[PDB]
Amino acid sequence: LNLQGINESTIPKVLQYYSAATEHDRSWYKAWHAWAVMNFEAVLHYKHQNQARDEKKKVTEDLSKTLLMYTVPAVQGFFRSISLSRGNNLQDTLRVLTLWFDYGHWPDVNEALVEGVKAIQIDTWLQVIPQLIARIDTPRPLVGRLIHQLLTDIGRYHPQALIYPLTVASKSTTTARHNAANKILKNMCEHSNTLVQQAMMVSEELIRVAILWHEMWHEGLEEASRLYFGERNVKGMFEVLEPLHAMMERGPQTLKETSFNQAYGRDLMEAQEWCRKYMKSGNVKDLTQAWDLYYHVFRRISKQLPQLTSLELQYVSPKLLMCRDLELAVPGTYDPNQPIIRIQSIAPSLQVITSKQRPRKLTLMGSNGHEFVFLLKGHEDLRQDERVMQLFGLVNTLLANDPTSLRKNLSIQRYAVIPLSTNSGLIGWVPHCDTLHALIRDYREKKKILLNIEHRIMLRMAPDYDHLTLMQKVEVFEHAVNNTAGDDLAKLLWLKSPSSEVWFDRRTNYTRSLAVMSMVGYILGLGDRHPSNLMLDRLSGKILHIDFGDCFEVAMTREKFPEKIPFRLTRMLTNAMEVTGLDGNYRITCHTVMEVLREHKDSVMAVLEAFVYDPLLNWRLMDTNTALNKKAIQIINRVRDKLTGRDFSHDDTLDVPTQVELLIKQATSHENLCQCYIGWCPFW
């Protein structure tokens, strides 16, 4: 393959070889995995050659026989390579899913899958419960029937792995998803019943906590004001507000909802009368009375919202207060090997974090006795973060297997992510952390340094900084960098450390962890890495990345404030490392990480392809664009080019040392840094 390539003549040969290998060593893992992946590539080669030739009657019927000739070997092979690996089967299991979803509606592919699902152990599927439930409502009947039957048996053993994603699906807006999820829950109830009732309540109450009525009305009136006064979209304004009226038409279910309907509810209902009068009259004097009432409650809410520093369970949701010694386990703790750390009790107070999104700080008591703190984010879809955490798990496995990486103790710091709805979900709170912006703020207030000193120096030298040309910007940026000693993080890393011996270990960890997430972020495409989005462990010294909302070079694509920096490698971070510079620990660590990922490119590619192609996550790519299938193909191709090293130039392949060096120059380039949005803080 390396000499010839993939084409019509090599595939029958390399299959002849792998078949012989399988014969001479049946038990050998690699012989089956290579045969399976080769068949699977022979499938996708002839599929993409059909679309290249046929799209751009008899040929498709021949293609049916042709692909099914290579599809059944691939399935049988992946199932045998799953059992042999017994703990490193992620790649293989996802490939099974891709094959099943695409071609499993065929009778013959279904048969192979049925025999396989019987043979394979049920613990294997727990890895890929997200990807299964994503296709819970597949239009193909023969596929969907086998999904249900598999989920049923995942319910009967390891139900704690299923209740959370099933409860989220059960309350989906689209009818087919919720129907399928409820039909599966109906079967799950007979085995336990208690689990289904507990998780359905807890999740409903957590959602209620995650977005209160006055918070929903606040975001709704902001959207409705932008539609009316901005866009003059009156029918769309009613579409925003009428769910909030139907929301309150349930009635007061808690004391907080009672006191809301008392204070505001009368005015909202009165404003709805003017809205319903406008619907059957069409007067400006009618609708202006409604906007007067809407802006009355909006101003009262805006005045209230800073005062909501904390929420008491007795008021917001007493159901959760009553909850004692639940069998439903703590989210994202369940392991089939470990003993279930079930929820003991929920603490009565919720320390509401004062941010733009106003996250909560949930904390649960475990049955083992340890407290578990969480972050309850509202209106921020966490399915991306869930998928991204699956990727980090894979990469950590790969680094553990490589001896060089293991010796260096390379790994990505990750945290639990548990979605609760399309809007809200739970994030696992990482302790002993604080944002880089906070650290620098507190150091500069201690040392009496102005927090915005670099920005102020720029605006002093050239007050039109935003509107300056590229060369002008580079001058101003460099003048700021030369006239500010960028050592605040290095200095504060020293002062914070109790002793030099610890400091050295903290700094080694810091440098290596940063390099690891620089390369992984580059491949994944992770942008929008301002200092609020990365946090530093004040004990281990390892860096943590959060809020992976932007992926696949979305930041580069967007017209406004495009980011040309692949990963954050700013001057302050470089100073925090060894005095010599990036040439030492950072560069060597980058080489090792890149080499391992390139070696295991097939595993990384398989995980990436599945979540990108997922229909639920297609929305982000569609929003980035300006059909959907073509956009997804381009994104996958770019990621593949990065792993190969042909990203910079398609014509010439680049070795790992050369690729890393070019990446470092681009990240640290003054011209690229200056363009970046000022909120990104290219100067720190």
Partner: protein, 317 residues
């Protein structure tokens, strides 16, 4: 300002355009330029009105009348206007912007909208009209020089070096050599094949001059076409002789002391009417009338609060 034969305007971040006098060094009158800086000035060959390319507006102020509001405010553009050319007949006006869309503006026509457009891949950094008034050289951030023909629209794209932003390029009045400059600090000289009607305009690479260490900013031949001034971010305005491509004189504004960071970039090079003197703007807020042979600051112009990005110079009788 206008009645005086020599003109010497100056403008930068302070929102003014100060019209100096070469014989004295006194600010005669300022002119307001709100909403933006000025990226490039240009006197018209007719000398009736100056130009002032800024952000989303090419303004053109009166040279004769004093203290007037902008005569023309060509709006309807975005992402700045890097440069402005001028047709020797005085009818057409060229521009270049970061929107990757060159333009031409008919001053005689009252229409606000432009006339022609030559879109390119990457943002256009500099324009330069060929003295024959038939070819329009167009640099860009990707490195691609172009020659958008003003009669056949046959652009002959050419990339001297891949992935280096060419920042300025000029062609001497005798159409002998064309020089280009990039952010590496090279000076690619091209020998012009003598074609006018044929419009072959073949560019023969002569010499890669290792002009500067750091970003170079503007190059411009003299009217004699014997000297090639080349400005850079190293605070030195080198002057290369056209024949031998050697450094005849190096005009530097360095401190003469290692303890002095970012004194200021030098991006001005306008030859005198007879190539005896050479004006030069710097980021230390000071224009400087240099001497070519000796290399001495004859007069210094001061009073600009902020940096000085533009110059204008006109000795046309």
């Amino acid at each position: 300002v206008g009645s005086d034969p020599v003109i010497l305007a100056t403008a930068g971040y302070d929102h003014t355009v100060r019209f100096w006098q070469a014989h004295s060094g006194i600010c005669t009158r300022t002119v307001q330029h709100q909403d933006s800086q000025v990226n490039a000035l240009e006197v018209t060959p007719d000398r009736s009105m100056i130009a002032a390319a800024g952000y989303q507006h090419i303004r053109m102020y009166d040279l004769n009348s004093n203290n007037p509001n902008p005569i023309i405010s060509y709006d309807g553009v975005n992402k700045n206007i890097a440069s402005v050319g001028f047709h020797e007949d005085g009818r057409w006006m060229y521009t270049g912007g970061e929107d990757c869309t060159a333009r031409i503006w008919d001053l005689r026509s009252r229409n606000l909208q432009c006339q022609r457009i030559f879109q390119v891949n990457a943002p256009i950094n500099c324009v330069c009209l060929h003295p024959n008034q038939a070819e329009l050289i167009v640099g860009d951030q990707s490195g691609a020089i172009h020659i958008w023909d003003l009669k056949t629209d046959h652009n002959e794209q050419l990339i001297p070096e891949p992935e280096v932003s060419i920042t300025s390029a000029h062609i001497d009045p005798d159409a002998s050599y064309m020089a280009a400059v990039n952010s590496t600090g090279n000076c690619y000289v091209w020998n012009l094949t003598g074609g006018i009607g044929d419009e072959v305009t073949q560019l023969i690479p002569k010499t890669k001059i290792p002009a500067h260490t750091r970003y170079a900013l503007q190059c411009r031949f003299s009217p004699d076409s014997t000297l090639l001034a080349t400005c850079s971010a190293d605070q030195t305005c080198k002057i290369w002789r056209t024949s031998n491509f050697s450094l005849m004189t190096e005009l530097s504004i360095k401190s003469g002391n290692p303890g002095e960071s970012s004194r200021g970039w030098m991006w001005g090079c306008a030859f005198s009417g007879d190539s005896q003197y050479i004006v030069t703007a710097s980021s230390d807020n000071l224009a400087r009338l240099w001497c070519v042979e000796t290399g001495e600051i004859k007069r210094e112009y001061g009073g600009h609060q902020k940096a000085v990005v533009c110059l204008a110079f006109n000795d046309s009788v």
